[PDB]
């Protein structure tokens, strides 16, 4: 029937040279592994185990960031297999500094960086399990709910190295307390709740564990330090790579200042006698 | 004075402070860059303009076979798609990668002095798209009474860094791969409706393009076709008769008009006999 000129033109065009400019892909493809949970809806009673099947994710570099032991860059995830990472979402990728790798070079014969990453991610998951328990038991009078971002393990061939990746938060990033026990002076309810949380972890684990270095945006936290409060040696004191002083626990008990949240949580004074 | 954690809760936390087993399943697959021939109006393909993609996409293919099928100017090898950025290709799906015979290149080197292979691929994919556009008009305008719709597979351009070369890629069809008509202008005698429709399609293209184009070498599995030969019925230029590289027989259009036999479909489409006169 009707065989237009547009239709004809578009057909005939295919018979001739159409311009083609091969442009290498944008960004880099990377492999992602997840630390899975046997019971997500009940994270504190769930078992953590590493996934085996690495899924691909496509990331594009945007910018950057530096803290203590890591270098961080902000990226965009344009796509990923089975949505292991959310497409159209911003992420932060972290890698350990030279000194840090050089410090655990002895502790970890081969795949030092890989192990450092595994431990770092496992550390944040531990904190996560504690915030989860916290939100389950805290009184209804306590509004907010601390939460740690999930971190994923990442392998990049481009760079030929292992990294940790997590969602990028938007807003003013702030540190509520640190590895030496210093705390900000709570100017609002949320900050109080955060400060009370570190106290709560100690009491909740019968003085066995303490989470310091609470930092993030709002109630969303990341990069915590999970301290085995009874270890008498730094080398075996922290879950993942962290800058700790052996005075940490003692310092926290001395410096911490209980607030209306600590009281709402019915938490005992950290200065009390441990055998009383 | 409190409500501390349980054993299960404590075990799950403390276990994270220790080395947990991580056995990364070994990496299989070949990294490749996929390029697509895009369309301005994919919804109205026959009224759409074709343009090559600029920015390449990432994908991974498993070369599970060394079996190179075919006897023509090209050879086909099955590969597996582990993953493809944006799922342009389907993961955990079999594809066919096609390349030409060095001889063929050597032949066209005297026409495509530079990046001969890539150029041939660009042409092959453009040729199949031309076939697709005609099939789109065909299925869109054909009478409702006709139950079948010819379909050409989509072909993508693929670059392999490891193999250091360009290939054309398309889904791998499973089933009896057959030919309805060929480059000589010869056709089979239809046994069923599907075949009658395939054969009528070739006739239809000649008619639809007012005698400018003829699609021959209809072949594939069932309705799904691939590797057709879009012939510029009037051209005389050495290698300018077919949109893509193909060996045409001694005056294929002549043979086709002479040997083709119209069927119930040709009549359903109201097509006129090819043996008639061009001018009278
Ligand atoms: N998840 C995040 N979202 C937004 N910004 C972040 C995030 N994590 C870290 N940052 C920013 O990048 C800086 C470095 O953080 P990081 O790489 O974790 O270093 P560190 O080795 O100190 O833990 C921080 O000071 C912070 O401003
Ligand atoms: N899309 C496909 N699906 C399944 N098999 C295919 C496909 N394309 C090609 N083949 C197989 O591989 C062979 C190569 O065909 P083709 O690319 O057309 O090369 P040739 O130039 O020799 O005709 C075919 O004969 C067929 O058996
Ligand atoms: Mg063939
Ligand atoms: Zn307190
Ligand atoms: Zn006919």
Coordinates of C-alpha atoms and ligand atoms in Angstrom, one line a residue:
Chain A
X1 CA 0.0 0.0 0.0
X2 CA 1.3 3.5 1.1
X3 CA 5.1 3.6 0.7
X4 CA 6.1 7.1 1.7
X5 CA 9.3 9.0 1.0
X6 CA 10.2 9.1 4.7
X7 CA 9.7 5.3 4.8
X8 CA 11.7 4.9 1.6
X9 CA 14.4 7.3 2.7
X10 CA 14.9 5.6 6.0
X11 CA 15.2 2.2 4.2
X12 CA 17.7 3.4 1.6
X13 CA 19.8 5.2 4.3
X14 CA 20.5 1.7 5.8
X15 CA 22.1 0.8 2.4
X16 CA 24.8 3.5 2.8
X17 CA 27.4 4.5 5.4
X18 CA 25.8 5.9 8.6
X19 CA 28.3 7.6 10.8
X20 CA 29.6 5.5 13.6
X21 CA 31.9 6.7 16.4
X22 CA 32.9 4.0 18.9
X23 CA 33.2 5.7 22.3
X24 CA 34.5 3.6 25.1
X25 CA 32.0 3.0 27.9
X26 CA 31.5 5.5 30.7
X27 CA 32.6 4.7 34.2
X28 CA 33.6 1.2 35.3
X29 CA 31.9 -2.1 35.9
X30 CA 32.5 -3.6 39.3
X31 CA 31.7 -6.8 41.2
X32 CA 29.6 -6.6 44.4
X33 CA 29.3 -9.0 47.2
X34 CA 26.8 -8.8 50.0
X35 CA 27.0 -9.9 53.6
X36 CA 23.7 -11.7 53.8
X37 CA 21.4 -12.2 56.8
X38 CA 19.4 -15.3 57.6
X39 CA 16.7 -13.2 59.2
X40 CA 16.5 -9.6 57.9
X41 CA 13.2 -8.8 59.7
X42 CA 14.9 -9.8 62.9
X43 CA 18.5 -8.6 62.2
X44 CA 19.7 -9.0 65.8
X45 CA 18.8 -12.7 65.8
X46 CA 20.0 -13.3 62.3
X47 CA 23.2 -14.9 61.1
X48 CA 25.6 -13.0 58.8
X49 CA 27.3 -14.9 56.0
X50 CA 29.0 -13.7 52.9
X51 CA 27.3 -14.2 49.5
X52 CA 29.4 -16.2 47.0
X53 CA 27.9 -15.0 43.7
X54 CA 29.3 -11.6 42.8
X55 CA 26.9 -9.4 40.9
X56 CA 27.9 -6.6 38.5
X57 CA 27.2 -3.0 39.0
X58 CA 27.9 0.0 36.8
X59 CA 29.3 3.0 38.5
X60 CA 30.4 6.4 37.3
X61 CA 32.7 8.7 39.3
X62 CA 31.5 12.1 40.4
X63 CA 33.9 13.6 42.9
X64 CA 36.3 13.5 45.9
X65 CA 36.9 12.9 50.8
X66 CA 39.2 12.0 53.6
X67 CA 38.9 11.0 57.3
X68 CA 41.3 8.9 59.3
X69 CA 42.2 5.6 57.7
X70 CA 40.3 5.7 54.4
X71 CA 40.0 7.6 51.0
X72 CA 36.4 8.0 49.7
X73 CA 34.9 8.8 46.3
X74 CA 31.3 9.6 45.4
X75 CA 29.8 7.7 42.6
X76 CA 26.6 7.1 40.7
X77 CA 25.2 3.6 40.1
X78 CA 23.6 3.6 36.7
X79 CA 22.7 -0.1 36.8
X80 CA 23.4 -3.4 38.6
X81 CA 22.5 -7.1 38.2
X82 CA 19.3 -8.0 40.1
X83 CA 19.5 -4.6 41.6
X84 CA 22.2 -5.5 44.2
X85 CA 22.7 -1.8 44.2
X86 CA 19.9 0.7 43.3
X87 CA 20.2 2.2 39.9
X88 CA 20.1 6.0 39.8
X89 CA 21.4 6.2 43.4
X90 CA 24.5 7.8 44.8
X91 CA 27.1 5.7 46.6
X92 CA 30.4 6.3 48.4
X93 CA 33.3 3.9 47.8
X94 CA 36.0 3.6 50.4
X95 CA 39.6 2.1 50.3
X96 CA 42.2 1.8 53.0
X97 CA 45.2 4.1 53.2
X98 CA 48.8 2.8 52.8
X99 CA 49.7 2.9 56.4
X100 CA 46.6 0.9 57.4
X101 CA 47.4 -1.9 55.0
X102 CA 51.0 -1.7 56.1
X103 CA 49.9 -2.1 59.7
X104 CA 47.8 -5.2 59.1
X105 CA 50.2 -6.6 56.5
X106 CA 51.5 -8.9 59.3
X107 CA 48.1 -9.9 60.7
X108 CA 46.9 -10.8 57.2
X109 CA 49.5 -12.6 55.0
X110 CA 47.7 -12.5 51.7
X111 CA 44.7 -10.4 50.6
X112 CA 45.3 -7.8 53.4
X113 CA 43.0 -5.2 51.8
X114 CA 40.3 -7.9 51.2
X115 CA 40.3 -8.9 54.9
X116 CA 40.4 -5.3 56.1
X117 CA 37.3 -4.7 53.9
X118 CA 35.6 -7.8 55.1
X119 CA 36.2 -6.8 58.8
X120 CA 35.2 -3.2 58.3
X121 CA 31.9 -4.3 56.8
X122 CA 31.4 -6.9 59.5
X123 CA 32.0 -4.2 62.1
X124 CA 29.3 -1.9 60.7
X125 CA 26.9 -4.9 60.5
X126 CA 27.6 -5.5 64.2
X127 CA 26.7 -1.9 65.1
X128 CA 23.6 -2.4 62.8
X129 CA 22.4 -5.4 64.8
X130 CA 22.8 -3.3 68.0
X131 CA 20.8 -0.3 66.6
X132 CA 18.2 -2.9 65.6
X133 CA 18.0 -4.4 69.1
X134 CA 17.9 -0.8 70.5
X135 CA 14.9 0.2 68.4
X136 CA 13.1 -2.9 69.5
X137 CA 13.6 -2.4 73.3
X138 CA 13.7 1.4 73.7
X139 CA 10.7 3.0 75.4
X140 CA 8.0 4.6 73.2
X141 CA 9.0 7.9 74.8
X142 CA 12.2 7.9 72.6
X143 CA 11.1 9.0 69.1
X144 CA 14.1 8.8 66.7
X145 CA 15.8 5.5 65.8
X146 CA 19.6 5.3 65.1
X147 CA 20.5 3.2 62.0
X148 CA 23.7 2.2 60.3
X149 CA 23.9 2.1 56.6
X150 CA 24.5 -1.3 55.0
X151 CA 27.9 -1.7 53.4
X152 CA 28.7 -3.9 50.4
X153 CA 32.0 -5.5 49.4
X154 CA 33.3 -4.3 46.0
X155 CA 35.9 -5.6 43.6
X156 CA 37.1 -3.3 40.8
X157 CA 39.4 -4.7 38.0
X158 CA 40.0 -1.3 36.6
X159 CA 41.8 -0.5 39.9
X160 CA 42.6 -4.1 40.6
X161 CA 41.6 -3.8 44.3
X162 CA 38.9 -4.3 46.9
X163 CA 36.7 -1.6 48.4
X164 CA 33.6 -1.0 50.6
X165 CA 30.6 0.7 49.2
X166 CA 27.5 2.3 50.8
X167 CA 24.8 4.7 49.9
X168 CA 25.8 8.4 49.9
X169 CA 23.8 10.4 52.5
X170 CA 22.7 14.0 51.8
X171 CA 22.9 16.6 54.5
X172 CA 25.4 17.9 57.1
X173 CA 27.6 15.0 58.1
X174 CA 28.5 15.2 61.8
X175 CA 30.3 13.2 64.5
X176 CA 28.4 12.7 67.7
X177 CA 31.3 11.1 69.7
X178 CA 34.7 9.6 68.8
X179 CA 37.2 6.8 69.7
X180 CA 38.6 8.7 72.7
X181 CA 35.3 9.3 74.4
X182 CA 34.7 13.0 73.5
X183 CA 31.1 13.9 73.0
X184 CA 29.4 16.9 71.6
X185 CA 27.0 18.8 73.9
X186 CA 23.6 17.7 72.7
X187 CA 21.7 20.6 71.3
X188 CA 18.6 18.6 70.4
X189 CA 16.7 15.4 71.2
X190 CA 18.3 13.4 68.3
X191 CA 21.8 14.1 69.5
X192 CA 20.9 13.1 73.0
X193 CA 19.5 9.8 71.7
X194 CA 22.7 9.2 69.8
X195 CA 24.8 9.9 72.9
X196 CA 22.6 7.6 74.9
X197 CA 23.0 4.9 72.3
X198 CA 26.7 4.4 73.0
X199 CA 25.9 4.2 76.7
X200 CA 23.1 1.7 76.0
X201 CA 25.4 -0.7 73.9
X202 CA 27.7 -1.0 76.9
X203 CA 25.0 -1.8 79.4
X204 CA 23.1 -4.0 77.0
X205 CA 26.2 -6.2 76.3
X206 CA 26.9 -6.4 80.0
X207 CA 30.0 -4.2 79.6
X208 CA 31.3 -6.5 76.9
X209 CA 30.9 -4.1 73.9
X210 CA 30.9 -0.4 73.3
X211 CA 30.1 1.4 70.0
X212 CA 31.9 4.7 69.6
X213 CA 32.6 7.1 66.7
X214 CA 28.9 7.6 66.1
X215 CA 28.7 9.8 62.9
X216 CA 26.4 10.5 60.0
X217 CA 23.5 12.6 59.0
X218 CA 20.4 12.8 61.2
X219 CA 19.7 9.3 62.5
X220 CA 21.6 7.6 59.7
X221 CA 25.1 6.5 60.8
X222 CA 28.2 5.0 59.3
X223 CA 31.9 4.2 60.1
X224 CA 31.4 3.2 63.7
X225 CA 34.0 1.7 66.1
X226 CA 32.9 -1.5 67.8
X227 CA 35.1 -2.0 70.8
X228 CA 35.5 -5.3 72.7
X229 CA 35.6 -3.4 76.0
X230 CA 37.3 -6.2 78.0
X231 CA 40.3 -6.7 75.7
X232 CA 43.5 -5.3 77.4
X233 CA 45.3 -5.0 74.0
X234 CA 44.3 -2.6 71.2
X235 CA 45.3 -5.1 68.6
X236 CA 42.4 -7.3 69.7
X237 CA 40.1 -4.5 70.9
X238 CA 38.3 -3.4 67.8
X239 CA 36.2 -5.4 65.3
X240 CA 37.4 -3.8 62.2
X241 CA 40.2 -1.4 61.4
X242 CA 40.0 1.5 63.8
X243 CA 42.1 4.2 65.6
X244 CA 41.7 3.3 69.2
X245 CA 43.4 4.3 72.5
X246 CA 43.7 1.7 75.2
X247 CA 42.2 4.4 77.5
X248 CA 39.1 4.3 75.3
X249 CA 36.7 2.4 77.7
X250 CA 38.0 4.1 80.8
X251 CA 37.9 7.4 79.1
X252 CA 34.4 6.9 77.9
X253 CA 33.2 5.9 81.4
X254 CA 34.8 9.0 82.8
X255 CA 33.9 11.5 80.2
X256 CA 30.4 10.4 79.1
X257 CA 27.5 12.6 80.5
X258 CA 24.1 11.0 80.9
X259 CA 21.2 12.9 79.6
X260 CA 17.4 12.7 79.6
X261 CA 17.6 9.9 77.2
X262 CA 20.0 7.9 79.3
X263 CA 17.6 8.4 82.1
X264 CA 14.5 7.5 80.0
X265 CA 16.4 4.3 79.1
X266 CA 17.0 3.7 82.8
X267 CA 20.8 3.4 82.2
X268 CA 23.1 3.1 85.3
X269 CA 26.0 5.5 85.8
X270 CA 29.1 4.3 83.9
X271 CA 31.2 5.5 86.8
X272 CA 29.7 3.0 89.3
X273 CA 31.7 0.0 90.7
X274 CA 31.6 -3.0 88.4
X275 CA 31.4 -5.6 91.2
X276 CA 28.8 -3.8 93.3
Chain B
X1 CA 18.5 -3.2 86.4
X2 CA 18.4 -4.1 82.7
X3 CA 17.4 -6.5 79.9
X4 CA 20.7 -7.3 78.1
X5 CA 21.0 -9.7 75.1
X6 CA 20.6 -13.5 74.7
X7 CA 23.1 -16.2 73.7
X8 CA 21.9 -16.2 70.1
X9 CA 22.1 -12.4 70.0
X10 CA 25.6 -12.4 71.5
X11 CA 26.8 -15.2 69.2
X12 CA 25.7 -13.3 66.1
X13 CA 27.5 -10.1 67.2
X14 CA 30.8 -11.7 68.4
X15 CA 31.0 -13.8 65.2
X16 CA 31.3 -10.6 63.2
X17 CA 34.5 -9.8 65.0
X18 CA 36.1 -12.9 63.6
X19 CA 37.1 -14.1 60.1
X20 CA 33.9 -15.3 58.4
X21 CA 34.2 -17.5 55.3
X22 CA 34.2 -15.7 52.0
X23 CA 34.5 -17.9 48.9
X24 CA 34.1 -15.7 45.8
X25 CA 32.8 -18.0 43.0
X26 CA 35.5 -17.7 40.3
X27 CA 35.0 -15.1 37.5
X28 CA 33.9 -16.5 34.1
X29 CA 33.0 -14.4 31.1
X30 CA 34.6 -12.2 28.5
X31 CA 34.2 -8.4 28.8
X32 CA 32.9 -6.7 25.7
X33 CA 31.5 -3.4 24.6
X34 CA 28.0 -3.5 23.0
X35 CA 26.9 -0.9 20.5
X36 CA 23.3 -0.6 19.3
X37 CA 21.8 0.8 16.1
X38 CA 19.2 3.1 17.6
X39 CA 15.8 4.3 16.3
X40 CA 14.2 7.7 16.5
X41 CA 10.7 6.2 16.8
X42 CA 11.0 2.5 17.8
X43 CA 7.2 2.4 18.1
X44 CA 6.8 3.3 14.4
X45 CA 9.9 1.5 13.1
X46 CA 9.1 1.9 9.4
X47 CA 8.9 5.7 10.0
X48 CA 12.0 5.8 12.2
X49 CA 15.5 7.1 11.6
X50 CA 18.4 4.8 12.4
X51 CA 21.6 6.1 14.0
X52 CA 24.4 4.2 15.7
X53 CA 25.0 4.6 19.4
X54 CA 27.9 6.8 20.5
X55 CA 28.7 5.6 24.0
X56 CA 29.4 1.9 24.3
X57 CA 27.9 -0.4 27.0
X58 CA 29.5 -3.1 29.1
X59 CA 28.6 -6.8 29.0
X60 CA 30.1 -10.1 29.8
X61 CA 30.0 -13.2 27.5
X62 CA 30.9 -16.8 28.2
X63 CA 32.6 -18.5 25.2
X64 CA 31.1 -21.9 25.9
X65 CA 31.8 -23.3 22.4
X66 CA 34.4 -23.7 19.7
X67 CA 31.7 -24.9 17.2
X68 CA 31.7 -22.4 14.3
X69 CA 28.5 -23.0 12.3
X70 CA 27.8 -22.0 8.7
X71 CA 29.4 -22.2 5.2
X72 CA 28.8 -18.7 3.8
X73 CA 31.0 -15.6 4.2
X74 CA 30.5 -15.8 7.9
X75 CA 30.8 -18.3 10.7
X76 CA 28.5 -18.4 13.8
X77 CA 29.5 -19.3 17.3
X78 CA 27.3 -19.7 20.3
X79 CA 28.2 -17.7 23.5
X80 CA 26.5 -17.1 26.8
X81 CA 25.6 -13.7 28.2
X82 CA 26.6 -13.6 31.9
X83 CA 25.5 -9.9 32.2
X84 CA 25.1 -6.8 30.0
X85 CA 24.8 -3.2 31.2
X86 CA 21.2 -2.1 31.2
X87 CA 20.3 -5.6 30.0
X88 CA 20.7 -4.7 26.3
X89 CA 21.6 -8.4 26.0
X90 CA 19.9 -10.9 28.2
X91 CA 21.9 -12.5 31.0
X92 CA 21.9 -16.2 31.3
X93 CA 20.9 -16.4 27.6
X94 CA 22.6 -17.8 24.5
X95 CA 23.7 -15.5 21.7
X96 CA 25.4 -16.0 18.4
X97 CA 28.5 -14.1 17.4
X98 CA 29.2 -13.7 13.7
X99 CA 32.5 -12.9 12.0
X100 CA 33.5 -13.0 8.3
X101 CA 36.1 -15.2 6.6
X102 CA 39.5 -13.5 6.1
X103 CA 39.0 -14.1 2.4
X104 CA 35.9 -12.0 2.5
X105 CA 37.8 -9.2 4.3
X106 CA 40.7 -9.4 1.9
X107 CA 38.0 -9.0 -0.8
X108 CA 36.4 -5.9 0.7
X109 CA 39.8 -4.5 1.8
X110 CA 39.8 -3.1 -1.8
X111 CA 36.7 -1.1 -0.8
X112 CA 37.1 -0.7 2.9
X113 CA 40.8 0.0 3.2
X114 CA 40.3 0.8 6.9
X115 CA 38.6 -1.3 9.7
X116 CA 37.2 -3.6 7.0
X117 CA 35.7 -6.1 9.6
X118 CA 33.9 -3.4 11.5
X119 CA 32.5 -1.8 8.3
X120 CA 31.2 -5.2 7.2
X121 CA 29.5 -5.6 10.5
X122 CA 28.0 -2.1 10.4
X123 CA 26.6 -3.1 7.0
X124 CA 25.2 -6.5 8.1
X125 CA 23.4 -5.0 11.0
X126 CA 22.0 -2.1 8.8
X127 CA 20.9 -4.7 6.3
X128 CA 19.0 -6.7 8.9
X129 CA 17.4 -3.5 10.2
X130 CA 16.2 -2.7 6.7
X131 CA 14.6 -6.1 6.7
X132 CA 13.1 -5.4 10.1
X133 CA 11.6 -2.1 8.9
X134 CA 9.9 -3.8 5.9
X135 CA 8.6 -6.6 8.1
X136 CA 7.1 -3.9 10.4
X137 CA 5.2 -2.3 7.6
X138 CA 4.2 -5.7 6.4
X139 CA 2.7 -6.9 9.7
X140 CA 1.1 -3.5 10.2
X141 CA -0.6 -3.4 6.8
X142 CA -1.2 -7.1 6.0
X143 CA -4.8 -8.3 6.1
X144 CA -6.2 -9.5 9.5
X145 CA -6.9 -12.9 7.9
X146 CA -3.1 -13.6 7.9
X147 CA -2.1 -15.4 11.1
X148 CA 1.7 -15.1 10.9
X149 CA 4.2 -12.3 11.2
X150 CA 7.8 -12.6 9.8
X151 CA 10.3 -11.2 12.3
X152 CA 14.0 -10.4 12.0
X153 CA 16.1 -10.7 15.1
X154 CA 17.8 -7.5 16.4
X155 CA 21.5 -7.5 15.8
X156 CA 24.0 -5.6 17.9
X157 CA 27.6 -4.5 17.3
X158 CA 30.0 -6.0 19.7
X159 CA 33.7 -5.4 20.3
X160 CA 36.0 -7.9 22.0
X161 CA 39.1 -6.6 23.6
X162 CA 40.5 -10.0 24.3
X163 CA 40.0 -11.2 20.8
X164 CA 40.8 -7.7 19.6
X165 CA 38.0 -7.5 17.0
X166 CA 34.4 -6.6 16.1
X167 CA 31.5 -9.0 15.7
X168 CA 27.7 -8.8 15.1
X169 CA 25.7 -10.4 17.9
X170 CA 22.1 -11.7 18.1
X171 CA 20.0 -14.0 20.2
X172 CA 20.5 -17.7 19.6
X173 CA 17.3 -19.4 18.3
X174 CA 16.8 -23.1 19.2
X175 CA 15.0 -25.2 16.7
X176 CA 15.3 -26.3 13.1
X177 CA 17.1 -23.5 11.3
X178 CA 15.8 -23.6 7.7
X179 CA 15.8 -21.6 4.5
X180 CA 12.6 -20.6 2.6
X181 CA 14.3 -19.0 -0.4
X182 CA 17.8 -18.2 -1.3
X183 CA 20.2 -15.8 -3.0
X184 CA 19.7 -17.5 -6.4
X185 CA 16.0 -16.4 -6.4
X186 CA 14.9 -20.0 -5.8
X187 CA 12.3 -20.9 -3.1
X188 CA 10.8 -24.0 -1.5
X189 CA 7.3 -25.3 -2.2
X190 CA 5.3 -24.3 0.8
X191 CA 3.9 -27.2 3.0
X192 CA 2.0 -24.9 5.4
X193 CA 0.7 -21.4 6.2
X194 CA 3.9 -20.2 7.8
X195 CA 6.0 -21.0 4.7
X196 CA 3.4 -19.6 2.4
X197 CA 3.6 -16.3 4.3
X198 CA 7.4 -16.2 4.3
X199 CA 7.5 -16.7 0.5
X200 CA 4.7 -14.1 0.0
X201 CA 6.7 -11.7 2.1
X202 CA 9.6 -11.7 -0.4
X203 CA 7.2 -11.0 -3.2
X204 CA 5.5 -8.3 -1.1
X205 CA 8.8 -6.4 -0.6
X206 CA 9.4 -6.2 -4.3
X207 CA 5.9 -4.8 -4.8
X208 CA 5.9 -2.6 -1.8
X209 CA 9.1 -0.8 -2.7
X210 CA 7.8 -0.4 -6.2
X211 CA 10.5 -2.7 -7.6
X212 CA 13.4 -1.1 -5.9
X213 CA 14.1 -3.7 -3.2
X214 CA 13.7 -7.4 -2.9
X215 CA 14.4 -9.4 0.3
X216 CA 15.7 -12.9 -0.4
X217 CA 17.4 -15.6 1.6
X218 CA 14.6 -15.7 4.2
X219 CA 15.8 -18.1 6.8
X220 CA 15.6 -18.9 10.5
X221 CA 13.3 -20.8 12.9
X222 CA 9.6 -20.5 12.3
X223 CA 8.6 -16.8 12.1
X224 CA 11.9 -15.6 13.5
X225 CA 14.3 -14.8 10.7
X226 CA 17.9 -13.6 10.4
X227 CA 20.6 -12.9 7.9
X228 CA 18.5 -11.8 5.0
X229 CA 19.7 -10.3 1.7
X230 CA 18.2 -6.9 0.9
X231 CA 18.8 -6.4 -2.8
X232 CA 18.8 -3.1 -4.6
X233 CA 17.0 -4.6 -7.6
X234 CA 18.5 -2.1 -10.1
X235 CA 22.0 -1.4 -9.0
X236 CA 24.9 -2.5 -11.2
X237 CA 27.9 -1.6 -8.9
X238 CA 30.2 -4.5 -8.1
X239 CA 29.5 -4.7 -4.4
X240 CA 26.5 -2.4 -4.2
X241 CA 23.7 -4.8 -5.1
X242 CA 23.0 -6.0 -1.6
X243 CA 22.8 -3.8 1.6
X244 CA 25.1 -6.3 3.2
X245 CA 27.8 -8.7 1.9
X246 CA 26.2 -11.6 0.1
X247 CA 26.9 -13.7 -3.1
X248 CA 24.1 -13.2 -5.5
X249 CA 23.5 -15.8 -8.2
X250 CA 23.4 -15.2 -11.9
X251 CA 20.7 -12.5 -12.0
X252 CA 18.8 -13.4 -8.9
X253 CA 16.0 -10.9 -9.4
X254 CA 15.4 -12.3 -12.9
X255 CA 15.3 -15.8 -11.4
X256 CA 13.0 -14.8 -8.6
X257 CA 10.4 -13.2 -10.9
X258 CA 10.7 -16.3 -13.1
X259 CA 10.6 -19.0 -10.5
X260 CA 8.4 -17.7 -7.7
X261 CA 4.9 -19.2 -7.4
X262 CA 2.2 -17.1 -5.8
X263 CA 0.1 -18.7 -3.0
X264 CA -3.0 -18.1 -1.0
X265 CA -1.1 -15.5 0.9
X266 CA 0.0 -13.6 -2.2
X267 CA -3.6 -13.4 -3.2
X268 CA -4.7 -12.5 0.3
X269 CA -2.2 -9.6 -0.1
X270 CA -3.6 -8.8 -3.6
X271 CA -0.1 -9.0 -5.1
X272 CA 0.2 -9.1 -8.9
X273 CA 2.2 -11.7 -10.8
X274 CA 5.9 -11.1 -11.2
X275 CA 6.0 -12.6 -14.7
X276 CA 3.9 -9.7 -15.9
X277 CA 5.5 -6.9 -17.9
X278 CA 7.3 -4.0 -16.0
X279 CA 6.0 -1.3 -18.4
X280 CA 2.9 -2.9 -20.0
Ligands
LIG1 N1 28.0 7.3 53.7 C1 28.4 8.5 53.6 N2 27.6 9.5 53.0 C2 28.0 10.8 52.8 N3 29.3 11.1 53.2 C3 30.2 10.2 53.7 C4 29.8 8.9 53.9 N4 30.8 8.2 54.5 C5 31.8 9.1 54.6 N5 31.4 10.3 54.1 C6 32.3 11.6 54.1 O1 33.7 11.3 53.6 C7 34.6 11.5 54.7 C8 35.6 10.3 54.9 O2 34.9 9.1 55.3 P1 35.5 7.7 55.3 O3 36.0 7.3 53.9 O4 34.7 6.6 55.8 O5 36.8 7.9 56.2 P2 37.3 7.3 57.6 O6 38.6 6.4 57.2 O7 37.6 8.4 58.5 O8 36.3 6.3 58.2 C9 33.8 11.8 56.0 O9 34.4 12.9 56.8 C10 32.4 12.3 55.4 O10 32.3 13.7 55.3
LIG2 N1 20.2 -16.4 15.3 C1 20.6 -17.6 15.2 N2 20.0 -18.6 16.0 C2 20.4 -19.9 15.9 N3 21.3 -20.3 14.9 C3 21.8 -19.4 14.1 C4 21.5 -18.0 14.2 N4 22.2 -17.4 13.3 C5 22.9 -18.2 12.6 N5 22.7 -19.5 13.1 C6 23.4 -20.8 12.7 O1 24.7 -20.6 12.3 C7 24.9 -20.6 10.8 C8 25.5 -19.3 10.4 O2 24.5 -18.6 9.5 P1 24.8 -17.2 8.9 O3 25.2 -16.2 9.9 O4 23.6 -16.7 8.1 O5 26.0 -17.5 7.9 P2 26.2 -17.8 6.4 O6 26.9 -16.6 5.7 O7 27.1 -19.0 6.2 O8 24.7 -18.1 5.8 C9 23.4 -20.8 10.3 O9 23.4 -21.6 9.1 C10 22.7 -21.4 11.5 O10 22.6 -22.8 11.5
LIG3 MG1 22.9 -19.3 6.8
LIG4 ZN1 24.4 7.9 79.7
LIG5 ZN1 3.6 -14.2 -5.0

